[PDB]
Structure formats: C-alpha cells, structure tokens
Amino acid sequence: PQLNSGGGDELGANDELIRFKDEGEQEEDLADVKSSLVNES
Amino acid sequence: HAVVNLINYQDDAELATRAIPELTKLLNDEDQVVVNKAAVMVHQLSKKEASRHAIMRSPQMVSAIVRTMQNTNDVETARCTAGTLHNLSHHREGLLAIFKSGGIPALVKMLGSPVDSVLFYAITTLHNLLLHQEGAKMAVRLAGGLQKMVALLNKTNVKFLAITTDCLQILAYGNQESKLIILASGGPQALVNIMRTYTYEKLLWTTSRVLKVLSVCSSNKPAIVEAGGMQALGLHLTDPSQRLVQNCLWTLRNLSDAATKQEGMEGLLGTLVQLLGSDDINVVTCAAGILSNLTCNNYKNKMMVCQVGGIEALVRTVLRAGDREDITEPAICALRHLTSRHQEAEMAQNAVRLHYGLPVVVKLLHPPSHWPLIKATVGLIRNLALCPANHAPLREQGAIPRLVQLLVRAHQDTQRRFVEGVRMEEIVEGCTGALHILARDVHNRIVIRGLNTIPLFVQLLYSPIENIQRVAAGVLCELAQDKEAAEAIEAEGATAPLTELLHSRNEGVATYAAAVLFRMSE
Numbered sequence: 276p277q278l279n280s281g282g283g284d285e286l287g288a289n290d291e292l293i294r295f296k297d298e299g300e301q302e303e304d305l306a307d308v309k310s311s312l313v314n315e316s
Numbered sequence: 317h318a319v320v321n322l323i324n325y326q327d328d329a330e331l332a333t334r335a336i337p338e339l340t341k342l343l344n345d346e347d348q349v350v351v352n353k354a355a356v357m358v359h360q361l362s363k364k365e366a367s368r369h370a371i372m373r374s375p376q377m378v379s380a381i382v383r384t385m386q387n388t389n390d391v392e393t394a395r396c397t398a399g400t401l402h403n404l405s406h407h408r409e410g411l412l413a414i415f416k417s418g419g420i421p422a423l424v425k426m427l428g429s430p431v432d433s434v435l436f437y438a439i440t441t442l443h444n445l446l447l448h449q450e451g452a453k454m455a456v457r458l459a460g461g462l463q464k465m466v467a468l469l470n471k472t473n474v475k476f477l478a479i480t481t482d483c484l485q486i487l488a489y490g491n492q493e494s495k496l497i498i499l500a501s502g503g504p505q506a507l508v509n510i511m512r513t514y515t516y517e518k519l520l521w522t523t524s525r526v527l528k529v530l531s532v533c534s535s536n537k538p539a540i541v542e543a544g545g546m547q548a549l550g551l552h553l554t555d556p557s558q559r560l561v562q563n564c565l566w567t568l569r570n571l572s573d574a575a576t577k578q579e580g581m582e583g584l585l586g587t588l589v590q591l592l593g594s595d596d597i598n599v600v601t602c603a604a605g606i607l608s609n610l611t612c613n614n615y616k617n618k619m620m621v622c623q624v625g626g627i628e629a630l631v632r633t634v635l636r637a638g639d640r641e642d643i644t645e646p647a648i649c650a651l652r653h654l655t656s657r658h659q660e661a662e663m664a665q666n667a668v669r670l671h672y673g674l675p676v677v678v679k680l681l682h683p684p685s686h687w688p689l690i691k692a693t694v695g696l697i698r699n700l701a702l703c704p705a706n707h708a709p710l711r712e713q714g715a716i717p718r719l720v721q722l723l724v725r726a727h728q729d730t731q732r733r734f735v736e737g738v739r740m741e742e743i744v745e746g747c748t749g750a751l752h753i754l755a756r757d758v759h760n761r762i763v764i765r766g767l768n769t770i771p772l773f774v775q776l777l778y779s780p781i782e783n784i785q786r787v788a789a790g791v792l793c794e795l796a797q798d799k800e801a802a803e804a805i806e807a808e809g810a811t812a813p814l815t816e817l818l819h820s821r822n823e824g825v826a827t828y829a830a831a832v833l834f835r836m837s838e
Binding site: 276277278279280283284286287288290294295296297301303309311313316 | 485572609
C-alpha cells in the first residue's frame with residue numbers, strides 16, 4: 276500500500292496543502308450609509 | 317411635552333378613524349390616477365414620525381401600500397409606496413407589519429426597477445428587515461432576492477453597493493444553498509470586480525465579508541480564484557483599514573489551497589512576506605498560512621518568495637513566535653516547501669542555517685509541540701539534511717535522538733490486532749526519511765547505529781506501506797557501508813525481506829535492497 280499523505284524521496288519531503296476553511300462569525304455601521312442614500316430621493 | 321402628547325393623541329385618533337381608512341379605499345380605486353395621488357398623500361403622512369403608527373397599525377393600509385407598489389406601472393407611485401414602507405421600517409412594530417403584509421416579495425420585485433429612488437428604498441428596507449425581522453432571510457431567499465441582488469452588483473453607486481453586498485453576506489452566512497445560488501448568478505466575478513474597482517472602504521469591507529463567506533464553499537472557491545480573487549484581495553493588504561486587511565487575509569487563506577496555479581502573484585507574495593513581521597498576531601498567522609499553501613508544489617512561487625527574502629522573514633517569524641503553533645506550523649510548512657525542488661532550494665537550505673534557524677527548528681520537535689507541527693518540522697529537517705553543511709549542526713542540536721524517539725513512539729502506536737489530525741504512519745515515513753538523508757554523513761551514521769535503530773529499521777522492511785519500505789531500505793543502505801552495521805543487519809535476519817523487496821515495482825526500493833544485500837555479502 277502507498278502512503279495516503281506526506282512521504283518523500285531523495286529530493287526531500289513532499290509538499291502538502293493545509294486545508295483552511297474558516298467562515299467564522301457573522302456579526303448578527305451602514306446606518307448612516309442607508310439614510311444618506313435615501314436622503315436624496 | 318404635555319401639549320404635543322395631547323395634540324398627537326388627537327391627531328392619531330383622526331388618522332386611525334378617518335384619514336387611514338379613507339386613503340386605503342382610494343389606494344384600492346380602479347382609477348390609477350386616484351391611486352397615484354393617494355399614494356402621494358400616504359407617503360407625505362409617513363414622513364411625520366407621529367403619523368406612522370396610525371399607518372402601520374392598519375393591516376388594510378399596509379397591504380394596500382404593498383399591493384400598489386408591486387402592481388403599479390407609475391414610477392412616481394412605486395417611489396412613494398416604497399418610500400412609505402421604508403419610513404415604517406425603523407422599528408419592530410413597523411418591520412413586523414411590512415413582513416405580515418407580504419412586503420418582502422414585493423420589495424424584492426422592486427429590485428428589478430430601473431429607477432434609483434425605488435432601488436434605494438427597496439434595498440435599505442430589505443436590509444432593515446434582514447437585520448431585525450425574524451424570518452426575513454428565508455422570505456428574501458424564497459422570493460429570489462439573491463439573484464436580483466447579485467444582478468445589481470453592476471450598478472455604480474458605492475453606498476448602494478455597500479448595502480446590497482451586506483444583504484448578500486447576511487443571506488449567505490452559514491447557508492450553503494444561498495452560496496450556490498450566488499455562484500449560479502455570477503456572484504464571484506461581480507464581487508471580485510468591485511474589489512479591484514472601488515476605493516470606498518465601507519464597500520470594500522462589506523464586499524470582502526461576502527467573499528470570506530463564499531471562500532469556504534468548495535464551488536465558489538475555485539470560481540473566486542479564477543475570477544482573479546487572489547490578486548484583487550491582495551490589493552488591499554496595506555490599506556489603512558485594519559478590518560479590511562484582516563478580512564482580505566482570512567479570505568485569501570481560505571482560498572489559498574486552490575490558487576497554487578495562479579499567475580500574477582508577485583505583488584501578493586511580496587506583501588505577505590512583509591506582513592510576516594507585523595506585530596498583529598492574526599496578520600502573521602494568515603500571512604504564514606497563505607504562503608505555505610502558495611509555495612506548495614509551485615517552483616515559481618518558491619523562487620519569488622526566496623528572492624524577496626522569505627527565508628529570513630520566516631525564520632524570524634518562527635524565532636519570535638515561541639509556542640504559538642498557529643504561526644509555527646504554517647511557517648515551518650512554508651520553509652519546508654522553500655527548501656526543496658526548485659533552483660534556489662539548495663540556497664534556501666543553507667540560508668535557514670545562515671539565519672540562525674537550526675536550533676529553534678530542532679527545538680520544535682520537542683514538547684509542547686503537537687503532531688501537526690512535529691510532522692511539518694520533521695519534513696523541514698529532512699530537506700535541510702540535503703545540505704552537507706547542515707549535517708553537523710543538526711547533529712549538534714540533538715536532532716538524531718529526537719527523530720529516533722518520534723519514530724519509535726509513532727511505530728509502536730501503529731500496532732493493532734489519527735492522532736491530533738496526523739497518522740502515525742506519516743511520522744514513521746517522515747522520521748526514517750529524515751534519518752536516511754542525515755545518514756549520508758559518517759559521524760551521523762555512528763550516532764544512528766549507537767541508538768540501536770537497526771532492529772527497528774529491519775522491522776520496517778515488513779511494513780505494508782511501500783513508502784516506509786523505501787526509507788527503511790534506504791537508511792539501512794547508508795548504514796550498511798559500515799562493516800559492523802552490515803553484519804548487525806544480517807544478524808537481524810534482514811536477508812529474507814530485502815531479497816523479497818528486490819522484486820518491488822519501486823525502483824528506489826529495489827536498488828536500496830540490492831545495495832544492502834551486496835554490503836552484507838561482502
């Protein structure tokens with residue numbers, strides 16, 4: 276069987292990707308942006 | 317205050333009993349000119365805060381306003397009615413009234429209007445609802461607001477775009493289905509365009525938040541990359557706004573593992589190397605992470621990072637990072653990538669030593685380091701060992717006995733009838749591979765054999781995993797050129813497995829096996 280990850284040879288260790296997938300935090304100041312937008316029509 | 321309270325109380329009664337019920341009837345008129353004129357009056361009334369309650373507390377009125385807006389063919393009428401609903405959307409009561417009156421589907425329909433005044437009233441009102449009305453998000457999605465919103469990203473008013481993008485962020489967060497709809501509507505390209513087009517910070521910020529949410533989606537991620545997302549987000553890494561810089565970094569990191577084939581990454585890479593020296597821990601952490609993924613199997617990126625002094629920058633990051641593994645793991649993985657398979661790989665292997673990084677690097681193999689960092693560090697040491705100049709210093713830092721310890725423990729833990737996200741089989745291959753390279757040196761060979769490793773290395777020849785068989789045969793190949801070692805290997809009964817390995821499809825395994833066999837016979 277072959278190694279699922281990692282490994283390497285005479286040229287060194289095999290490069291590997293770090294799976295980043297952080298969505299984290301939905302802040303559940305556009306107030307002025309909103310009023311400003313509507314205060315012209 | 318008593319005067320206004322009395323006057324308002326009286327006016328509220330006159331409105332709730334005469335004005336409102338009358339205007340509701342007129343809004344329902346067959347004559348469109350009457351409806352239009354009535355819509356104006358209702359709008360004028362909505363401008364006065366004290367008059368709003370009379371308007372919102374009448375379901376018949378609200379429903380007539382919504383129905384009129386959604387069905388009218390008069391621009392001015394659509395404007396007045398949308399403006400009215402906006403005026404009623406500042407508090408819980410009004411929002412609930414608009415919601416129960418079926419205002420959401422009507423407000424969404426208005427997003428298809430070519431008139432700015434209508435669009436502006438529509439998006440800000442939907443935003444208020446999205447922020448405070450429970451059930452608003454699902455209604456907007458069901459009404460197809462996502463598609464309409466994405467289509468509006470080609471508009472030019474930056475304030476309008478800021479609100480529109482924020483609605484997308486609110487609707488998309490933690491909702492995989494909403495992200496796919498956005499993707500299907502061409503959201504990625506439209507969002508990336510904004511990032512490389514406008515300078516309005518609030519818009520870049522809200523837009524970067526939508527991209528972050530979409531960056532964890534396996535479908536949106538490659539779409540963002542292909543749209544030039546990486547280069548675009550990189551444009552703002554030095555912007556005065558910290559919230560923007562950090563959102564761009566988090567997004568870049570999420571996307572990084574799917575951007576290893578992108579061109580035009582010079583500027584981005586150069587900026588990330590600089591950020592490695594930031595006092596901000598979250599910035600250094602993201603810079604290290606993104607660089608690790610970008611240098612992965614891309615010689616061009618490796619070359620550029622080295623050319624901008626990435627080796628020195630990464631060693632410095634590791635030196636001041638101490639036990640923070642969030643920083644050291646990616647930084648070490650980056651150094652690992654940079655020390656192999658490229659024109660400047662050899663130069664990078666020496667540079668780590670020349671920048672006083674060997675001691676701290678070997679130190680990371682020891683507690684309290686966790687398996688992810690150890691695995692990465694073993695990989696880096698393995699590459700550093702390719703450089704003859706690193707043979708002695710690595711031994712002097714105690715790398716050999718620590719690698720042997722990790723190997724023994726990892727191997728014994730594989731005995732049976734994932735640890736901290738790492739398979740012990742990976743550590744066995746890694747440590748043995750590192751030892752195989754370090755064994756090219758004669759003094760190291762003595763140290764290695766003195767730790768009574770031969771019995772283990774021979775045992776490894778029986779491993780099902782051929783990658784492990786390869787490194788075991790290889791280290792034995794190096795050690796075997798020593799008489800006592802060759803005889804010890806023979807005594808361990810290595811002749812049988814090695815003979816079997818001679819047939820291995822793996823040329824490396826076969827060659828090493830034969831080498832060891834020849835050494836023993838001699």
